[PDB]
Amino acid sequence: MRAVILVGGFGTRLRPLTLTTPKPLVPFCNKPMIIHQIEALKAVGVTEVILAVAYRPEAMKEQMDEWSRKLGVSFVFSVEEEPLGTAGPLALARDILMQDDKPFFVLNSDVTCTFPMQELLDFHKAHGGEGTIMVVTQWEKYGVVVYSPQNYQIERFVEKPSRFLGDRINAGIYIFNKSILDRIPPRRASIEKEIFPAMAAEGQLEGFWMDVGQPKDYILGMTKFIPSLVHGNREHTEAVEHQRGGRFTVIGASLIDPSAKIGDGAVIGPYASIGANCVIGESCRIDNAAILENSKVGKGTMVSRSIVGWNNRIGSWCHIKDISVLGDDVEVKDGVILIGTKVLPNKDVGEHRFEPGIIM
Amino acid sequence: MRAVILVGGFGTRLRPLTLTTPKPLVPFCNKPMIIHQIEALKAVGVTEVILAVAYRPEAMKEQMDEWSRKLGVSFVFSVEEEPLGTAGPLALARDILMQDDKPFFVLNSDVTCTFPMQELLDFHKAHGGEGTIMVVTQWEKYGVVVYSPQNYQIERFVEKPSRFLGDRINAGIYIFNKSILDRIPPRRASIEKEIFPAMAAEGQLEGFWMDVGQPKDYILGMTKFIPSLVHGNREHTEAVEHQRGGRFTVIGASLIDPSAKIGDGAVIGPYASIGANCVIGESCRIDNAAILENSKVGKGTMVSRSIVGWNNRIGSWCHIKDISVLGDDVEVKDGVILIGTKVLPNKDVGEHRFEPGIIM
Ligand SMILES: Nc1nc2c(ncn2[C@@H]2O[C@H](COP(=O)(O)OP(=O)(O)O[C@H]3O[C@H](CO)[C@@H](O)[C@H](O)[C@@H]3O)[C@@H](O)[C@H]2O)c(=O)[nH]1
Ligand SMILES: Nc1nc2c(ncn2[C@@H]2O[C@H](COP(=O)(O)OP(=O)(O)O[C@H]3O[C@H](CO)[C@@H](O)[C@H](O)[C@@H]3O)[C@@H](O)[C@H]2O)c(=O)[nH]1
Ligand SMILES: [Mg+2]
Ligand SMILES: [Mg+2]
């Protein structure tokens, strides 16, 4: 009946875009990352969502703007504990307890997946069935390796192993009972306080899954996510939007906000997202690139596999390719080629950069 | 009544384009380099032009194609003497003498200028007044430094001085009397056999001038030459051609052959030349670039300050910038960025190149 969406975190990996807005609130395709999870939780039977915000408590205004659909008015913060925020639910053990006794969800704010949230009870094992499903299944460099046999047990939990194999990792979605919040409230920073060795069956995905918290991970997660959204979002059959401005062609599926304007002959490539009020030039090429909001693009740029931040002003014949994240209010002069260079907010780029790097 | 246009030479400096056609026959703006000089000679009083062709005697067919206007049928070659071809006029001393006794012009085939060819006799000093006029006035690295006082005498003649100052250099256009061809015919290779120390008067440019024999020199000479052509060729007032295909905008003056096709929204930049039968994409940018013939360009490329050879097929969203000469029948894949890379004929480019170099 309640969920704990961990939103407090510096967002160091997605740095060029998180210098302006918290990582939960940077849009993924056309909505903020937390909004997808909040919509899934609205689909399942919960009403109140509590947020543990630490990095930037000024997300309250944006949440109130998005507060119309769901009652997510709850907001708690005293002092920076941890981006992982194990004490997050523990610091708010009183609110979860006295209102209701039902199990409470715990989710990361930078995770995208099918979001099952099944109405099936799954009362023999809470987190084992959900989160990382048992047949997740990717590189072991990031995320915790989970060793689970066919009988849904867990005995090992290593956050960042050096080389331990175990391609299965947690999806980042957890469901806990009221005993967990009362089990280990250490009152300080800790990492998820998983004491799974002690027990099995109590207390503690088939679909795409991606930890959308890094630029390349952002692009790959968008690539995996856009095809799965064709069933429900706006249902001219090549993509979600094919006629918004003039006459443009689309290759593959793409998400284009009806408020955007597209020039004559632009080629919106596979798995691309165009934000609200965005303007796209005559003969652009948006190949697996995300344009956030209010950005303007000249005639003939090819922004490919990169991210264009809010209120940008891209030049006329630029190349923004590889993994190059542009910050807020970044203006790029005509003919500038950016390849894997991250630009901090409020900068003007007039020089070419053929190697990965950072622009202050 | 006769002229000797030196056309025999390997064209090593303009190599990527001269591997297919001799340097005289590579088009400058819309016509071969020799054709401008032949037209100027036709403007002045002369009928027969003799060519000393060494590198490729296959230029005969193209000359016969251009033979309609002028009687340039003469062609002489026995064995490779020199690209400078001092023995050129000397090896054909019999034809110039017996036919006529009038002074004969001598020109380089890679020189562009105002081409005065004044009908004034200027018989007090033949080459002093013409060629390098005395007030040429450029770098001393290339060309011979000519030291001329206000009385029009030549004393020193050093082909490639190390550091001798003397910004004045010869224009490359010479006029000689019948004594020169009978003075020193050594029957072998030599360098212009200039014996100016012996004589001062009659023994033998106020305008733009450029030795168009190098890629960067080609671009700069085209830049200096197109504005001077606005008076004569085709006299919508921004450039020579402004409406040939769809609706495109032009910045500055440019030469576009009526046989070409231009897309909707292309921006033909300052001092650009488009060849016959060439096709330009929807939103290209032709900035100080020359398209030779039959080349096709996709939607949104920016070919800037570079040369695109015959029968090319440029990709859709390329960037051919800096001084990057493309050879005959070179195909470039979409999104390829070429910066100062010369491509030999009959090659396919699919990889980026951010540094000057050669593509085999
Ligand atoms: N940096 C950041 N982290 C946040 C934020 N909001 C919440 N977090 C939480 O910070 C935690 C760790 O930061 P991440 O970079 O997001 O996770 P990670 O360290 O790459 O790995 C963690 O997430 C995996 C999910 O893919 C999980 O394996 C597990 O949470 C792991 O500790 C996550 O649990 C996430 O909920 C934010 O705005 N910024
Ligand atoms: N390489 C080449 N040279 C040719 C060709 N046809 C004629 N030539 C003659 O080859 C001579 C020297 O080669 P260039 O590269 O054209 O001249 P340069 O060595 O840069 O300098 C010469 O030209 C200057 C005019 O700018 C003059 O200073 C003088 O001719 C000097 O030797 C020039 O006189 C030119 O007429 C050709 O197809 N290729
Ligand atoms: Mg994460
Ligand atoms: Mg020359």
PDB file of C-alpha atoms in Angstrom, chain A residues 267-360:
ATOM      1  CA  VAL A 267      15.221  11.496 -40.472  1.00  0.00           C
ATOM      2  CA  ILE A 268      14.277  10.539 -36.910  1.00  0.00           C
ATOM      3  CA  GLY A 269      16.409   7.438 -36.456  1.00  0.00           C
ATOM      4  CA  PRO A 270      15.790   4.258 -34.480  1.00  0.00           C
ATOM      5  CA  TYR A 271      14.940   4.669 -30.789  1.00  0.00           C
ATOM      6  CA  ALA A 272      15.035   8.460 -30.515  1.00  0.00           C
ATOM      7  CA  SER A 273      13.142  10.760 -28.151  1.00  0.00           C
ATOM      8  CA  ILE A 274      12.206  14.396 -28.820  1.00  0.00           C
ATOM      9  CA  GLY A 275      11.108  16.565 -25.914  1.00  0.00           C
ATOM     10  CA  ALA A 276       8.412  19.177 -25.486  1.00  0.00           C
ATOM     11  CA  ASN A 277       8.622  22.445 -27.439  1.00  0.00           C
ATOM     12  CA  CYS A 278      11.705  21.093 -29.208  1.00  0.00           C
ATOM     13  CA  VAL A 279      12.518  22.357 -32.703  1.00  0.00           C
ATOM     14  CA  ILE A 280      14.313  20.101 -35.193  1.00  0.00           C
ATOM     15  CA  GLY A 281      15.892  21.542 -38.330  1.00  0.00           C
ATOM     16  CA  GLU A 282      15.130  20.714 -41.949  1.00  0.00           C
ATOM     17  CA  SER A 283      17.445  17.749 -42.586  1.00  0.00           C
ATOM     18  CA  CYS A 284      18.619  16.562 -39.178  1.00  0.00           C
ATOM     19  CA  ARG A 285      19.313  12.953 -38.192  1.00  0.00           C
ATOM     20  CA  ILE A 286      18.288  11.872 -34.693  1.00  0.00           C
ATOM     21  CA  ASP A 287      19.881   8.421 -34.367  1.00  0.00           C
ATOM     22  CA  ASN A 288      19.360   6.867 -30.919  1.00  0.00           C
ATOM     23  CA  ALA A 289      19.620  10.342 -29.388  1.00  0.00           C
ATOM     24  CA  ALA A 290      17.465  12.017 -26.747  1.00  0.00           C
ATOM     25  CA  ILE A 291      16.535  15.704 -26.966  1.00  0.00           C
ATOM     26  CA  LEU A 292      15.343  16.787 -23.548  1.00  0.00           C
ATOM     27  CA  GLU A 293      13.297  19.991 -23.768  1.00  0.00           C
ATOM     28  CA  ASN A 294      13.166  23.405 -25.478  1.00  0.00           C
ATOM     29  CA  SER A 295      16.297  22.539 -27.472  1.00  0.00           C
ATOM     30  CA  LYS A 296      16.728  23.968 -30.971  1.00  0.00           C
ATOM     31  CA  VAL A 297      18.630  22.240 -33.775  1.00  0.00           C
ATOM     32  CA  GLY A 298      19.839  23.716 -37.057  1.00  0.00           C
ATOM     33  CA  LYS A 299      19.665  22.362 -40.594  1.00  0.00           C
ATOM     34  CA  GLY A 300      21.654  19.176 -41.072  1.00  0.00           C
ATOM     35  CA  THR A 301      23.159  18.180 -37.730  1.00  0.00           C
ATOM     36  CA  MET A 302      23.452  14.477 -36.917  1.00  0.00           C
ATOM     37  CA  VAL A 303      23.058  13.966 -33.169  1.00  0.00           C
ATOM     38  CA  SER A 304      23.709  10.239 -32.769  1.00  0.00           C
ATOM     39  CA  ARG A 305      23.725   8.088 -29.618  1.00  0.00           C
ATOM     40  CA  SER A 306      24.154  11.200 -27.446  1.00  0.00           C
ATOM     41  CA  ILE A 307      22.025  13.309 -25.110  1.00  0.00           C
ATOM     42  CA  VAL A 308      21.065  16.954 -25.685  1.00  0.00           C
ATOM     43  CA  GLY A 309      20.160  18.807 -22.504  1.00  0.00           C
ATOM     44  CA  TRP A 310      17.452  21.309 -21.684  1.00  0.00           C
ATOM     45  CA  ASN A 311      17.236  24.683 -23.430  1.00  0.00           C
ATOM     46  CA  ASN A 312      20.130  23.887 -25.755  1.00  0.00           C
ATOM     47  CA  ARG A 313      20.790  25.725 -29.024  1.00  0.00           C
ATOM     48  CA  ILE A 314      22.580  23.400 -31.437  1.00  0.00           C
ATOM     49  CA  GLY A 315      24.171  24.985 -34.493  1.00  0.00           C
ATOM     50  CA  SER A 316      23.358  24.345 -38.138  1.00  0.00           C
ATOM     51  CA  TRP A 317      25.783  21.648 -39.368  1.00  0.00           C
ATOM     52  CA  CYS A 318      27.116  20.117 -36.152  1.00  0.00           C
ATOM     53  CA  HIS A 319      28.040  16.517 -35.371  1.00  0.00           C
ATOM     54  CA  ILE A 320      27.149  15.348 -31.860  1.00  0.00           C
ATOM     55  CA  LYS A 321      27.936  11.637 -31.890  1.00  0.00           C
ATOM     56  CA  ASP A 322      29.412   8.808 -29.783  1.00  0.00           C
ATOM     57  CA  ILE A 323      28.499   9.265 -26.101  1.00  0.00           C
ATOM     58  CA  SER A 324      28.536  13.049 -25.596  1.00  0.00           C
ATOM     59  CA  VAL A 325      26.176  14.467 -22.974  1.00  0.00           C
ATOM     60  CA  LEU A 326      25.261  18.140 -23.326  1.00  0.00           C
ATOM     61  CA  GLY A 327      24.258  20.091 -20.239  1.00  0.00           C
ATOM     62  CA  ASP A 328      21.645  22.761 -19.699  1.00  0.00           C
ATOM     63  CA  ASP A 329      21.726  25.870 -21.908  1.00  0.00           C
ATOM     64  CA  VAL A 330      24.715  24.744 -23.996  1.00  0.00           C
ATOM     65  CA  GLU A 331      25.088  26.559 -27.323  1.00  0.00           C
ATOM     66  CA  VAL A 332      27.093  24.965 -30.144  1.00  0.00           C
ATOM     67  CA  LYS A 333      28.361  26.982 -33.099  1.00  0.00           C
ATOM     68  CA  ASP A 334      27.893  25.877 -36.698  1.00  0.00           C
ATOM     69  CA  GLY A 335      30.110  23.083 -37.981  1.00  0.00           C
ATOM     70  CA  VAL A 336      31.332  22.020 -34.530  1.00  0.00           C
ATOM     71  CA  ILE A 337      31.997  18.277 -34.265  1.00  0.00           C
ATOM     72  CA  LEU A 338      31.590  16.814 -30.774  1.00  0.00           C
ATOM     73  CA  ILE A 339      32.564  13.166 -30.267  1.00  0.00           C
ATOM     74  CA  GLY A 340      32.172  11.855 -26.733  1.00  0.00           C
ATOM     75  CA  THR A 341      32.677  15.234 -25.035  1.00  0.00           C
ATOM     76  CA  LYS A 342      30.498  16.167 -22.061  1.00  0.00           C
ATOM     77  CA  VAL A 343      29.670  19.876 -21.801  1.00  0.00           C
ATOM     78  CA  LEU A 344      28.846  21.436 -18.446  1.00  0.00           C
ATOM     79  CA  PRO A 345      25.790  23.716 -18.235  1.00  0.00           C
ATOM     80  CA  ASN A 346      25.927  27.269 -19.600  1.00  0.00           C
ATOM     81  CA  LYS A 347      28.816  26.877 -22.034  1.00  0.00           C
ATOM     82  CA  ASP A 348      29.482  27.882 -25.638  1.00  0.00           C
ATOM     83  CA  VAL A 349      31.317  25.377 -27.846  1.00  0.00           C
ATOM     84  CA  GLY A 350      33.077  26.713 -30.922  1.00  0.00           C
ATOM     85  CA  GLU A 351      36.005  24.322 -31.295  1.00  0.00           C
ATOM     86  CA  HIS A 352      36.106  20.781 -32.631  1.00  0.00           C
ATOM     87  CA  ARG A 353      36.783  17.875 -30.275  1.00  0.00           C
ATOM     88  CA  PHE A 354      37.548  14.505 -31.873  1.00  0.00           C
ATOM     89  CA  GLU A 355      38.402  12.685 -28.632  1.00  0.00           C
ATOM     90  CA  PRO A 356      36.399  11.908 -25.486  1.00  0.00           C
ATOM     91  CA  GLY A 357      36.795  14.598 -22.868  1.00  0.00           C
ATOM     92  CA  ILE A 358      35.144  17.240 -20.720  1.00  0.00           C
ATOM     93  CA  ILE A 359      34.288  20.847 -21.600  1.00  0.00           C
ATOM     94  CA  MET A 360      34.119  23.137 -18.577  1.00  0.00           C
TER      95      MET A 360
END
